[PDB]
Design a protein around this nucleic acid. Structure first.
Lengths: 94, 129, 184, 182, 198, 67
RNA sequence: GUUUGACCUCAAAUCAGGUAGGAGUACCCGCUGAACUUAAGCAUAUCAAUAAGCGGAGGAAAAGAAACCAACCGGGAUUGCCUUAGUAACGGCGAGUGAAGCGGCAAAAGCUCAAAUUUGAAAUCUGGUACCUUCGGUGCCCGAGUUGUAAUUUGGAGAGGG
């Protein structure tokens, strides 16, 4: 049953990497088309929040950092549409 | 190097080859179509014409069962938008998703670099007189 | 259970600083002059306490009284002013510099040890800004420096400088590495 | 002096030392109230170059203001100055400077001078603020941030707001009629 | 075989008409790179090097009436200054154009281009600067528009026309049209001795 | 002024390198100046500012392993 | 020293000494901010950067001694009036909107900090007390300040010396 356990490891990783935010969806859209390749994202992946250890810090401090360490960047309607469809889950309701 | 027409020396730098770097805001187009809606070509069995003008036959001749399976359980790489080179969804690779997730929650992006390099005091080595 | 908000805030700050990784420019302190050499420095500095307001006032009144009826060199004293200390530093006039490790604004003192080592002026980190304050007739100064000294204490000052160089400057030069705050 | 070194260091806000300092202070202030007095300024050089003095009568206050805007047309710096002047009614606001910022809020430090204190009144270099004409300078946008937002400057770029948009609009939109018509 | 790249740079003061002209030129040329601004002159060569670009086009303007253009090979090639006076933007409704963006252009040069060494030099510069490489990254296979160049009264006239067919071909004017003079020629890229002056 | 330059160098050494500066020096070490300049003129707006930053990073790298 | 105090932060007094609300509002400084009306009915547009509403001052307010205007034989704080000029210029380039340089005149005043060690002496000052030639001055006392209070100076430069 070694392979069975290995499959669950990838499933857990995938669930923790799937796009679930509007900003993430916009980044994925820009990566798909030739607007911003991997190098462009890597260059842009350096901001005020980089180089911040979080494994040792207390949970009550990370939670404060979690909800106060975000950047509001220009979102796109096309990307916002994709996340709405992804979140999508009837005769009785009709 | 040789001089200019009037008593001015000039270094003849080698002619620069107009090649494209791995990241120069230009991707492997391969389709020659711009930012036009993909509504066209739906009835035709091809998607535009690539460089030099030959038909790009549509390879996304999938089955109904495959489409339904990919509709309920969306692929991990699913991104919605279609690819310019074919009607199949431009699904992103897991490596790209990993980088996207790292960027989206303030993780390290340029790996293999130590975030805690010692402060090499280059200036303190010297001493004033 | 509940405690005062400020007490909880300061305890959280302490347990965060103990657990937060800091660049080597920070945590350059916490490697400080030992108790022995610190006590020796205090003893040496205890003989050069700056004249307090009362002492200066009484001396001036006594001098005026003698003058009313009808030469000594500059009194050597410790220099503590941050602006004056940083002015003696970068000019090579400073011989011994003491740095407090518990300054509230860390940025005010982060560069001082680096500048002192760059200028080749002996420097030492001592725990407690109050201790510097207690010997300067002030609550705290965060810094202390020495200038021209009496011939009797010249040998003591030289020995203290040599001891500081052997103990703290040379031993803790490795402080550049080992990012502080890595305790589990 | 150390003021030059502090000024040079502060410019490198992205530096690791200042990065950690800001990462700590953002939580330290967030744990505190929105507005609270500060015992000493976290940026002594900036306050000193802004006219602040350590003598009695000067107070340093810390304030928090939300970010964002379906639109707004005033700087967060001016809003913070107004919100701190609306509490210390007996204090005169001179200027303020940035000390830290957050994704959801921005933090600014404002120096306050009390005209009632005799030391300020007896000081010829600061007694000028005791005049009632300077009352609630922040509320009228007379501070550095207020003047910058108002556009008070010189040159063609500020003709419409060289001496106040409302004042110039009123002056120019008037049908002057002299006794002897021109 | 042929491979070339072009760099587009505009100084402060480019009016909306000149900006539209530059934008449509960047659309007609698929091997073109655009930059935000320029302030001061030799720095332009470095910008082309940063992109490995073999050509650079600079739209100088002393005042916001008279457009000026510089065409040169950044590395060590000569530069020519053009005092463009007439200018028609791509946003004119009088011309109907369905030209494919970045398609192969067809040049048309009269005999005056071969009448002098500098005329030949400018002809070659236009040929390789405006001639999209056959294997350009953003080029298109089919041919749909052509470029016409004619020089009379010592100044070169620029025209562009789209091609059309019927059920044996016809063409209709498209794109911008303007007149360019020859002001100054330099041996080197934005430097060196002044070889030619009108 | 020599004193001003000394103070600026001391601040730069003590302050360190910002994450964008860190990436700039990393690209200089592991790559050429082309990518470094392209990133500098993408974070910074003016070209001369990017050139000055690149020159400063090059000087820092040169002085890091020397003396 | 299984102790004591230094500090730093934070509280309380019907504590000693103080200040703030509010009213008025023609003018001043900001915030907020529509519509009726008008043009090819009204998409941009005019009404409007207005009324209403909100906050802050005085007898005036604001601004004011250039990161200014110009391209010349240069002007030389700000404000106000005439001209500039119904001009430059905007304007689904349709209605309409609309300056600014300079020139003529009422008035003129320029300045103060940061950043330099007083280092042969924090030389500074809030407050309590006893007096007096009481819008304040002297002695004494406590405290604030060295994370900077005294003196000089800042593009007209300036500073240490002979």
């Amino acid at each position: 049953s070694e392979e069975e356990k290995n499959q669950t490891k990838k499933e857990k990783h995938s669930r923790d990497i799937d796009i679930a935010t509007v900003e993430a969806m916009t980044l994925a859209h820009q990566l798909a088309l030739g607007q911003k390749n991997k190098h462009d994202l890597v260059d842009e992946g350096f901001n005020r929040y980089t180089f911040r250890d979080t494994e040792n810090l207390p949970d009550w401090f990370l939670e404060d950092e979690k909800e106060h360490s975000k950047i509001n960047k220009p979102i796109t309607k096309e990307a916002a549409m994709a996340i709405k469809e992804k979140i999508k889950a009837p005769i009785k309701k009709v | 190097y040789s001089k200019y027409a009037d008593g001015s020396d000039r270094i003849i730098k080698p002619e620069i080859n107009p090649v494209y770097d791995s990241d120069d805001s230009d991707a492997e187009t391969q389709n020659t179509i711009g930012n036009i809606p993909l509504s066209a070509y739906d009835e035709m069995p091809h998607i535009g014409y690539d460089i030099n003008g030959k038909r790009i036959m549509r390879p996304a001749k999938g089955s109904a069962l495959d489409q339904l399976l990919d509709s309920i359980e969306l692929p991990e790489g699913w991104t919605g938008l279609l690819d310019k080179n074919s009607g199949s969804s431009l699904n992103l690779t897991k490596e790209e998703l990993e980088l996207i997730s790292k960027i989206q929650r303030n993780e390290q992006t340029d790996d293999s670099i130590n975030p805690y390099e010692p402060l090499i005091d280059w200036f303190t080595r010297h001493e004033e007189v | 259970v509940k405690w005062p908000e400020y007490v909880r805030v300061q305890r959280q700050k302490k347990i965060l600083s103990i657990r937060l990784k800091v660049p080597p420019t920070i945590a350059q302190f916490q490697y400080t002059l030992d108790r022995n050499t610190a006590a020796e420095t205090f003893k040496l500095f205890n003989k050069y306490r700056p004249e307090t307001a009362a002492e200066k006032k009484e001396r001036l009144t006594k001098e005026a009284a003698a003058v009313a009826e009808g030469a000594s060199p500059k009194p050597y004293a410790v220099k503590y002013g941050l602006n004056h200390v940083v002015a003696l530093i970068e000019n090579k006039k400073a011989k011994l510099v003491l740095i407090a490790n518990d300054v509230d604004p860390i940025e005010l003192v982060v560069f001082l040890p680096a500048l002192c080592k760059k200028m080749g002026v002996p420097y030492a980190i001592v725990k407690g800004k109050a201790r510097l304050g207690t010997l300067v007739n002030q609550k705290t100064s965060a810094v202390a420096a020495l200038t021209e000294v009496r011939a009797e204490d010249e040998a003591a000052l030289a020995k203290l400088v040599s001891t500081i160089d052997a103990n703290f400057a040379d031993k803790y030069d490795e402080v550049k590495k080992h990012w502080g705050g890595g305790i589990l | 002096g150390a003021y030059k070194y502090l000024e040079e260091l502060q410019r490198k806000k992205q530096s690791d030392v200042l990065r950690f300092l800001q990462r700590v202070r953002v939580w330290e202030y967030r744990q505190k109230n929105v507005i609270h007095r500060a015992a000493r300024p976290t940026r002594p050089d900036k306050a000193r170059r802004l006219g602040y003095k350590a003598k009695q009568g000067f107070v340093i206050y810390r304030v928090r203001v939300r970010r964002g805007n379906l639109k707004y047309q005033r700087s967060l710096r001016a809003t913070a100055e107004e919100r701190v002047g609306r509490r210390a009614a007996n204090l005169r606001v001179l200027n303020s400077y940035w000390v830290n910022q957050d994704s959801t809020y921005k933090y600014f430090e404002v120096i306050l001078v009390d005209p009632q204190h005799k030391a300020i009144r007896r000081d010829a270099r600061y007694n000028w603020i005791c005049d009632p004409v300077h009352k609630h300078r922040e509320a009228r946008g007379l501070t550095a941030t207020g003047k910058k937002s108002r556009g008070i400057n010189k040159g063609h770029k500020f003709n419409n707001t060289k001496a106040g948009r409302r004042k110039t609009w009123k002056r120019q939109n008037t049908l002057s009629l002299w006794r002897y018509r021109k | 075989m042929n491979k070339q790249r072009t760099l587009l740079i505009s100084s402060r003061g480019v009016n909306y008409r000149h900006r539209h002209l530059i934008q449509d030129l960047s659309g007609l040329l698929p091997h073109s790179r655009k930059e935000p601004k320029l302030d001061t002159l030799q720095q332009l060569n470095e910008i082309a090097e940063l992109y490995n670009c073999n050509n650079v086009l600079f739209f100088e303007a002393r005042k916001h009436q008279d457009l000026y253009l510089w065409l040169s090979k950044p590395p060590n090639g000569p530069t020519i200054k053009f005092y463009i006076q007439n200018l028609h933007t791509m946003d004119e409704l009088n011309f109907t154009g369905n030209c494919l963006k970045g398609s192969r252009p067809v040049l048309s040069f009269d005999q005056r281009f071969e009448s002098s060494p500098h005329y030949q030099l400018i002809k070659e510069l236009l040929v390789h600067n405006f001639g999209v490489p056959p294997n350009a990254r953003k080029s298109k296979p089919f041919i749909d528009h052509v470029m016409s160049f004619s020089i009379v009264d010592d100044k070169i006239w620029v025209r562009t026309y789209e091609i059309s067919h019927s059920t044996d071909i016809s063409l209709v004017e498209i794109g911008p049209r303007f007149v360019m003079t020859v002001i100054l020629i330099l041996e080197g890229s934005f430097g060196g001795p002044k070889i030619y002056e009108n | 002024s020599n004193r001003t330059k000394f103070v600026r160098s001391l601040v730069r050494e003590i302050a360190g390198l910002s994450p964008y500066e860190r990436r700039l020096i990393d690209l200089i070490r592991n790559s050429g100046e082309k990518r470094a300049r392209k990133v500098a003129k993408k974070r910074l707006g003016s070209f001369t500012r990017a050139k000055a930053k690149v020159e400063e990073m090059n000087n820092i790298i040169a002085a890091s392993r020397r003396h």
